[model samples]
Target: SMTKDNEVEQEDLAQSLSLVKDVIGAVDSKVASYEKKVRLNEIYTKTDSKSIMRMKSGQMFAKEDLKRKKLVRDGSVFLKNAAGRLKEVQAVLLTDILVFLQEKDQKYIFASLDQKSTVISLKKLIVREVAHEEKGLFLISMGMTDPEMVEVHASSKEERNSWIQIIQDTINTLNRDEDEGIPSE
Candidate 1:
């Protein structure tokens, strides 16, 4: 339902795994999605810039501060008996230091930046994929021309640093410098 772009296509999940690790235990909430044809992983981490923006909208800085932005991002997330039967969570979010849990059962639940909700299901635990836009947001705003290259590592440190430098550069370039709107409040 969006553009015909696919960055993290099928090459590798390594880079994604690293980023996901960085965000682990930092999810604020679970998004609600009943659509099966959900956009693949590529959309979130490497698709069009707008899709990435969608992901960023889901993250809130401080913690459970939903009053400001209805969609908060960055909090702790875990399934009941997380170590028991939970294979891997589909997706998790942080709604202002709160965790939103997304289930494959089609339940629509989200968290803000300053609230928390407890959810439990004795059934088989199957979470949904997270829907944050930062991955794509960073990718696009940073001036990454080749969408395919995102899945792989930057060739030289120069290239890697180039990418990283461009990100902040782009922000300054676009004058879209935002200082963790979820925090400092």
Candidate 2:
């Protein structure tokens, strides 16, 4: 009984939802696999902590060293008005880095693996949640030479808050470490 126009709109919505869920599943699986690897390592509980290990990304850190290292948040976000276009982006927030992934063609099976990646270091990241906006969007400004600022919209206010809190906490931690003459991980 529905009109043809309404059906097309519904189909688009469904496709969009499916894409977002696919991205979330892909990123979450990566996080879970990393956590498992960290747990299985034999050096995970070495009290003396004399050894340093390397991650797949070629960064070095101590085993089981939770200090200044963790998966803060990961979720699907709409990076508002990116280059004058809007699309769902998968955002992964880590203690030291923020990664943004964009979906590619559907011909391939793994969209996440084949998608583009943008990495932003949290060393000098700044974020602010906007008020009275049409959507729950926040601004991220990195002190970088290229594309220094970006606006991202969350599903809701609570989700936006979660992202802001985690980002700010990590930034503050890094700043505090620098002030106290401690090396950040």
Candidate 3:
């Protein structure tokens, strides 16, 4: 007893329903594939069973706590020495600290605890651009009296700007946390 127009509408609706079902099936298949891969990786690597994360140095940190700490900035740059020589160094900028590493014999060795390998806390970090020598270089001063300042040269203007912004933001956030009586990480 249906009109011809109603029958045509019903046929269109059926086609749309079939297409939706096919799309859903495809998406579900992809999700299952992804889940399987993740499980396999966890099993083979034993990453899921590990409770601690180890830095290149002999430091072992809790994995869960480390996961909460975000990597804010990082890059390869030349570390300018007091004698004005540029040494290639890798910088790892984390939310709480900055780590410097040097390459030796194809492996990245963390700066020594007494020299370069020691982590710099973000509490008193002072970042400023260098005036005279290079275009994309900045000087980072740790403490007011600490003579351990590092002059790092960025690869490009854009990268230099990015590093400055991210470091400044992190410092500001750390200050705010301190003001609020929140414990440092």
Candidate 4:
């Protein structure tokens, strides 16, 4: 009879401990939020370490350029230039812009060619599905001063699609940021 009585008492204790686990769940989310921010911090830190610059034109690219900008996705892709020649470039998709960088002497510099700017505005970005490309390729018609067409090729059709999807979504992400934030007076 005493054993049954003690069992019920422990059952009541179990319910009380559930409240503790609830608080833990809340704390777990708090830790997760900070972890996301730190990952972004790591991106900035890595960019700083790699030391980014612009080629030929000596365009000013400073850390402040990345201020308030969120990194969407980045990867290596082959960029087709004026003569249809392919140059391997590092494509960095940010909140508002797509930047192409080339590595030189352990530094990441802008991949500019044909007097066209490497800094592409997502506000004015127009990604096109190109049937002319055999596979794993896409075209970028940006609102540019030069108005030159840009094409990039990835490793596979899947990789190309993923890049295009993220680029489009990141554009949408910026739109929400504009809507959610206060309208300037």
Candidate 5:
């Protein structure tokens, strides 16, 4: 139904449309050809695996230090509190932070010792697996305190709360600068 207002030459439209389709098909075919060539090259060379890059010594030390500090806060042999001591009660602490650092195949709490398998489908696998916490490490280096390893030699409740206050302040500092973007150095 070609109305006077919307009338257009069918032959002209078909010719131009076919030309566009040809151009797209050619580009797609070339792309597929090149991609297949790359796969063949990889198969021949057998260079199909990649390695996770290691962090610098200084960076590793910082994260380890943080982990140690947080452990001290939680509980450790030889640390004695003065204000009061909460009886060391073993319990599974749930944290997204520990999701990967922990053994994923085993359930933390269960009647049976059988392994429970799980899979994480990341929206950005490379970015999520590596960069997410690395960015936090850089933040720690720039200014944020790694509460994981904040040491409190004294086990007094007051002393412990003071240590927590220090962490709270550090959090405030990070939260304030969040909109400013990630730290550079």
Candidate 6:
């Protein structure tokens, strides 16, 4: 037999150490074979308003807010509260910001420790990794003396690094674009 569903019994994992190399290739989870083809770095995704709507997850923001935005990667993360409590949440990474959602019966819900942090801008955000007793990462933004910090955990240490690595490149890209629009004296 040529195959047993490959789905019924099969396969794989090729690691990309330079996560940046896989960053652009992380398309709608649909580029396993094609990615090895060419200049994927320019594959800036154009948003499909529907997916954005679904990813919004319960009255967080209107579709207009996500208009013209491009999708990066959407992953499940465990968001932590100040008390160190963790909730199973999902994350949406876009061209402009990061959004956290609570998955309930297949619906995307919002967050609490959450508030002050349901949404964040890459423009002023920081992706800090936590190596203490947990496979975690932190998303922080500072626009004031008191920062808005959302601590989250990925399923694996490898997954955590991927998120941080990708976010760093994204933040750098954002900063690069912004710096272009304004000149320094």
In candidate 6, which residue pairs get closer than 3 Å at backbone N, Cα or C atoms, i.e. clash?
112-115
TM-score of each: 0.19, 0.48, 0.52, 0.59, 0.20, 0.58
lDDT of 2 by residue, 1-185 (tens): 11312111111111223311124554454344346324322213321232332222334333234322344556666654435355566565554445444444431111121112233444456566767554455544334322334556677767777777766665665454332112222
lDDT of 3 by residue, 1-185 (tens): 11312111111111223311124654454334334333422221332223322222324422232233334455677776556666566665654455454555454444333332223444446566666545455534334334355666778666666667766766665554233111123
RMSD of 5: 22.6
How far does residue 44 in candidate 5 sit from its true spot (Å)?
50
Give the TM-score comparing model 4 with the true structure, all chains together. Answer: 0.59
**Candidate 1 regions with alpha-carbon error over 4 angstroms:** 1-54, 59-152, 176-185
lDDT value, candidate 5, whole model: 0.20
Clash list (residue pairs), candidate 3? 111-117, 112-117
| Descending-TM-score candidate ranking | 4, 6, 3, 2, 5, 1
Error of 3 at 158 (Å): 3.6
Alpha-carbon shift of residue 82 in model 5 (angstroms): 23
Write the residue-wise lDDT of candidate 5 on 32-144 in tens digits: 43343333222212311221111111121112211211111122111112332322211111100110111122311111111110101111111111132211111011123
RMSD of each: 18.7, 18.5, 16.5, 14.7, 22.6, 12.9
Model 2 alpha-carbon drift over 4 Å, by segment: 1-70, 105-118, 131-134, 142-147, 179-185
Q: Whose lDDT is higher: candidate 4's or candidate 5's?
A: 4
Query: How do the candidates rank by lDDT, highest first?
Result: 4, 6, 3, 2, 1, 5
Q: Model 4 misses residue 21 by how many Å?
A: 24
Worst lDDT run of 10 residues, candidate 5, spans: 117-126
Residue 124 Cα positional deviation in candidate 4, in Å, after optimal superposition: 4.3
Q: Model-by-model lDDT, in order?
A: 0.22, 0.42, 0.44, 0.50, 0.20, 0.49
Model with the higher TM-score, candidate 1 or 6: 6
